[PDB]
Amino acid sequence: ERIREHLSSEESVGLLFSGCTGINDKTLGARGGEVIMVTSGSGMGKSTFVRQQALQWGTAMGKKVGLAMLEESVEETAEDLIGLHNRVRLRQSDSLKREIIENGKFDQWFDELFGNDTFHLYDSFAEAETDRLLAKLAYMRSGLGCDVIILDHISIVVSASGESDERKMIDNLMTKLKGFAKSTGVVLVVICHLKNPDKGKAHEEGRPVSITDLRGSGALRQLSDTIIALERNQQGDMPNLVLVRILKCRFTGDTGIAGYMEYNKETGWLEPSS
Amino acid sequence: MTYNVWNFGESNGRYSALTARGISKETCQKAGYWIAKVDGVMYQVADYRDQNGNIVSQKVRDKDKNFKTTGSHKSDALFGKHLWNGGKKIVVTEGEIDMLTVMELQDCKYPVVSLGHGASAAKKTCAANYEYFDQFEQIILMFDMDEAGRKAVEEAAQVLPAGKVRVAVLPCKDANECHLNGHDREIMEQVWNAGPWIPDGVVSALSLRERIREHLSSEESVGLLFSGCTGINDKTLGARGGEVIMVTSGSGMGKSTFVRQQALQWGTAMGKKVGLAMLEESVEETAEDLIGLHNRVRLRQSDSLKREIIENGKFDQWFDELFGNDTFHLYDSFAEAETDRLLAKLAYMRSGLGCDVIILDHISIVVSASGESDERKMIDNLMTKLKGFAKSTGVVLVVICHLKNPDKGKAHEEGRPVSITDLRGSGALRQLSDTIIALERNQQGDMPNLVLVRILKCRFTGDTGIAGYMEYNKETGWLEPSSYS
Amino acid sequence: GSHKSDALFGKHLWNGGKKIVVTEGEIDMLTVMELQDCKYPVVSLGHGASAAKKTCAANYEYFDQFEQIILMFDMDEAGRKAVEEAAQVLPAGKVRVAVLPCKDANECHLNGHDREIMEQVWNAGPWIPDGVVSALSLR
């Protein structure tokens, strides 16, 4: 009976990765209980890729998405979603900001987006303790009833914290996040950064990213079920061209390069091909 | 269905002292808190008057601490609201007895208010009273010190005027529990020392739309404009408050000269209060550069002219012309500052002196917690604290770092575009910093004064690459914009 | 008796006013009152220069009755630290630091410099260390 109930409801194709495909061809979406790992270099598209998925899922397939943008205030993150939804770089314009305010178009777009109460976020920025996030991440999942939790940046370093080498902190945290993800069945999307090789041209100038290039003592390479990686050469002749590489997919096992995408400097989207 | 307003001269009313609470008669009389003797019982009535004195609602309790409401107890119910027309700080308690505690200790001379519908409607009550609470510079959220109390604090800070939120943490249950115990010493300092921080950490389901509108109106997206070369503005749209600008180049190529132009430019044309942290030079030397830079000259190479124009009356002229607006602030030590012997001072500018831009030249002078192997963590640890400070205050922070020595081919001074990997420190600064400006020039080429500007990162826009070019005017010491391709 | 941390020598003499002088030693508090004919608010610190932060913090409510708080501490290495640790827990906008040509207030009086003491009660605010000196005062 539980498998019948499982097979009938389980969003196994639930919330397919938008912006590009081949990712769907190699991962078949994001299952509930899996931990999706998104990574790239600094300023390449970790936040932007994940931000499209959070927007898309909570609109087209309408899901209660939980956000944890620990590096930016919620008004800034909402600011992106509003512009991203309306295909504009609203953050990148004083005219567009002044426009929608004075002519009352701001309220218009906002109700069109958040009007479902499908978007829930985390607001603090000032140091989130490990079990002072998991409680709130669960509060979304459980109290607010979210289907997807989005955790930007898996660090919160700063603190000493009394235990040398935070290589265990990232490991200890990832396990509980996988636990939380599975015991509730919530799709868990987390963003991590990449180590510094300093051993040739690196990341921002190209270079494929392997699982070893992942920050931390690769525990995230174990607990996570699927690993999405973005690669682009911001000094190349197409700095907006970004390559998607699957480093892991516990569900399928089909790895390799999925497809390509192009950063539309007008809409702020990652349109597939061009 | 709601009760009728009790009358003071019709229900055995008297203004007695709450001896078992620690509140005297004089205090009860001023807040409008009296005791009624109806049916032989002993009820305590809290008069929630409006801006006129007319009782609107009342909150009546007896021996067993049961609640009974009379009148029109609307969502904006604030016990003591009628006593204060505004000011500097306002204390927001949970219960009326706690509101009676602060006034007793402050001799009923300072604004203190209580919540109408307990800790539950804290969010709604504070939301209903946004217009009123914004007449004060600070809002002292001293709720109960329990599980439910901290959630009420959480739901309060969400719908309160941004930047004015402050939370009190008492060694006991509530304000009254401290008073009757010992701790009259522990309450008041936290009324004047409570932490000015954020809600943390749910804060979901929009509810901030209008505040984002309020936000978008006050902090622009073309925050400031880097002068010296257009194109930097095209790819970064300036430097917002709360961002971290990262400026770097080779040694003696114009890290200091480039940044100093922006500090000068911003503090003159756009009259912003610029804070300087020139760790590798006395305050007089950085001022010396600024003085010459403002007057399009170099007061470091013309040596006869230095002694001349100063002792003649052209120094005092330029000095008042430049620093007279009281905008420029610098750091004076050179005696190896400690990390939390800089951030304290850097915050003092931003906060005490009120600066808009803080400039930290050279971020490799750590000098902090000696004994830990590799300063690779110190630079990372510092950047985290700098980013926190930068965003939590909304200050523009421009920091200068240096570049690792590659020794793998011709390096930096001979050209060589500097990538993000070439950045000094275990690239944590490539993460915490939002915008990264890099200067490149071949000081052994046909165009040494020609400098290439390269954006290595801009979390705001995401538009990277080569901006434009500039030329070092040896006469003016400026970075004039060039026409090169 | 009970030397609580809010010990302020002379606190019982004033109920607010325009300005109040906060010395370190009671003897220095006796100097300022001597020059002012005991007509203007002058107080001393209970626990010396060490608990300067705690004593001033304990009397923030009291010191907040005045428009200005004249920190006339000693003029040594420890004295300047006491100025630093007091001014942190004092009302921002009511500080001011006294700089004497001698050791303390009494050392000036016994020498010549009554001409340096009272006048130096009128001098701005900043506060606290390292400057930062808003350029203008670096001329």
Curated annotation (Swiss-Prot), chain B:
One GO term (biological process): viral DNA genome replication
The UniProt site entry described as dTTP/dATP binding is assigned to: R298, H402, R441, R459, Y472
Record carries keyword Magnesium: yes
The protein's annotated catalytic reaction(s) are: ATP + H2O = ADP + phosphate + H(+)
Residue sites binding ATP per the record: S249, G250, S251, G252, M253, G254, K255, S256
Instruction: Please report which protein family the annotation says this sequence is part of.
Output: Belongs to the Teseptimavirus DNA helicase/primase family.
What does this chain do?
ATP-dependent DNA helicase and primase essential for viral DNA replication and recombination. The helicase moves 5' -> 3' on the lagging strand template, unwinding the DNA duplex ahead of the leading strand polymerase at the replication fork and generating ssDNA for both leading and lagging strand synthesis. ATP or dTTP hydrolysis propels each helicase domain to translocate 2 nt per step sequentially along DNA. Mediates strand transfer when a joint molecule is available and participates in recombinational DNA repair through its role in strand exchange.
Full protein name: DNA helicase/primase
Q: What is the lineage of its organism?
A: Viruses, Duplodnaviria, Heunggongvirae, Uroviricota, Caudoviricetes
